[PDB]
Amino acid sequence: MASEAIKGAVVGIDLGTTNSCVAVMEGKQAKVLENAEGARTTPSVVAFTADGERLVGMPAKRQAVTNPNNTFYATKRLIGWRYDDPEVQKDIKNVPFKIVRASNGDAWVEAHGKLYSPSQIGAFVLMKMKETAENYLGHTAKNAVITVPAYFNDSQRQATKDAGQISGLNVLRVINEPTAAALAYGLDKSEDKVIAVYDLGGGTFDISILEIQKGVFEVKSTNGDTFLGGEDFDQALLRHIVKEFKRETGVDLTKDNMALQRVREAAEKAKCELSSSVQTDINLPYLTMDSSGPKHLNMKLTRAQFEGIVTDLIRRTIAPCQKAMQDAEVSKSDIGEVILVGGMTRMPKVQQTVQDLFGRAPSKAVNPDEAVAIGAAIQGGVLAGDVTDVLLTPLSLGIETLGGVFTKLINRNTTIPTKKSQVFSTAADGQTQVEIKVCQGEREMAGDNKLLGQFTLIGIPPAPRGVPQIEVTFDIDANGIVHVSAKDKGTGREQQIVIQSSGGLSKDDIE
């Protein structure tokens, strides 16, 4: 079968259970695209109004209170799941909306007397990211790569393929989340190894042990914690702050709402701050109103206190890792690399725990928040698309001007067989000799970088300054052969210069 003639762009959509992400391969690196409101993440919430609407994203979380029986949130827990299943039976009680039984025994969702399958909700979210990717691209995107968790069956993969197809999107291939993380971290072009993927920070925790034999990733074992995630750390810090404030003054912010929101945002800011700084402080002036007057919150929080608050949660990420190591039939010495994914894999306690569990220093070369989407974009670009061709300059060149300014005639990062032309005027009125000095460098001063050669153009008709025009054309050809010449329309007398070898003294002179 011949070439597919893709002639299109492949986007890597990370269809998350709470927060999604879309990334595209702009040049040599995967670039994550931002939606309309400037955020780098589209919440996976779909809600329908009374008459008809398809509010997806933040405009669907915001209106959730006025529309509690129609907003579908975190529907990735019901994809490809039969209605008469333990997971759906446990989930139906908690979700305010009505999960109904379909004709083919599939757990569907209900909205204003219209039947929606869990694939269709994800299809609508995929339409949202397709719009937010077409906005950046300019032209429509047809082929895409969507990621699924490593514990998904083949039926769930088929369901996600259908969800991608429904949203006018021919799904290229369904990838694993650990495989996408490994691709983003750059372990695709590596020899045979065994690695483990630490996914903590989202709404769930997942640990998967991979294998990179023959350049293809094979999943060995998967495990994790269902009821553990990055929200519990924030909740623990919030509860500690509330209790400390109540002890300090005597007012509990639990009955408050605006004060609770301010305290929650300050707790998130401090928690994100308590990863590169030892000590932090939380300032929230005019937090609450009391008969005695306004009350201000001022807490000094150190790293040790934060580590002691959430120590139980991090401890809970130890048994699943050991079980995954046991089921993978590899001890702590087989694992040759550790992949960190998720938002909560930044605090040094989590990294220390991971190193203790695996015996290796975890790799933190890629922002763990958006590694899955970046890996999906990279794999989509490599698999189909003329991007690998582009996969395969410490100094530049310039000339001398009358004012001494190092004009940049040619760019730094330019291929050798490139010809460019530029016209220049005479120095002063009545001038008859035009001199051009060739130098190599990046600073804006010809003499402060190098001194290669000098050639003088002799013979020009008399004219007032600014009227004569001299065209400078560079004819660098082949590889390493430099042709520097100046052309003038006045007299047929030009000059040549060699400048074939430059920058021989490659040392710290630039530095």
Binding site: K7, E37, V65, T66, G138, H139, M258, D386
Partner: protein
């Protein structure tokens, strides 16, 4: 073998001509997209700064609203000057916000719309048309049509009767 080799060479020539045309289309697309991105980064680009200073503006407004407006007399000469300084600072910060496109969202009696307002409760209000916003708990902000922070409203609800 020479004939089939030349046929393959001609097919490769056609493929590389098509690829060259695709590259020209791609660089034109990059030019247009670069223009759009430069314009957007000209308009926005103060998004993080404004989203951080919203809380400073809220604190200053609360400070202006918290003094009981009774002890600012000549009996407390130093308190009066502090209040005047706070008021001047609040006015100056609201003047700086307005210059750079920051428009506070205060829908006192407007119609609810999820793109800009975040609902906080659905309390029914008698005498008010259903679907309108009863009160604004916090005035949201938006710059150049991009809602930085929604206005936390309370949407009225149709009466159960």
């Amino acid at each position: 073998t020479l004939l089939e080799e030349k046929v393959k060479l001609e097919e490769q020539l056609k493929e590389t001509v098509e690829k060259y045309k695709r590259a020209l289309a791609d660089t034109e697309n990059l030019r247009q997209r670069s223009q759009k991105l430069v314009e957007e980064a000209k308009l926005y680009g103060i998004q993080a700064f404004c989203k951080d200073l919203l809380e400073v503006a809220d604190v200053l407004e609360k400070a202006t609203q918290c003094v009981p407006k009774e002890e600012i007399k000549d009996d407390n000469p130093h308190l009066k000057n502090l209040y005047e300084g706070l008021v001047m600072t609040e006015v100056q910060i609201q003047k700086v916000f307005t210059k750079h496109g920051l428009l506070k969202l205060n829908p006192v009696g407007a119609k609810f719309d999820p793109a800009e307002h975040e609902a906080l409760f659905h309390t029914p209000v008698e005498g008010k048309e259903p679907g309108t916003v009863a009160l604004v708990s916090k005035v949201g902000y938006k710059l150049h049509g991009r809602t930085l922070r929604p206005a936390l409203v309370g949407v009225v609800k149709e009466a159960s009767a």
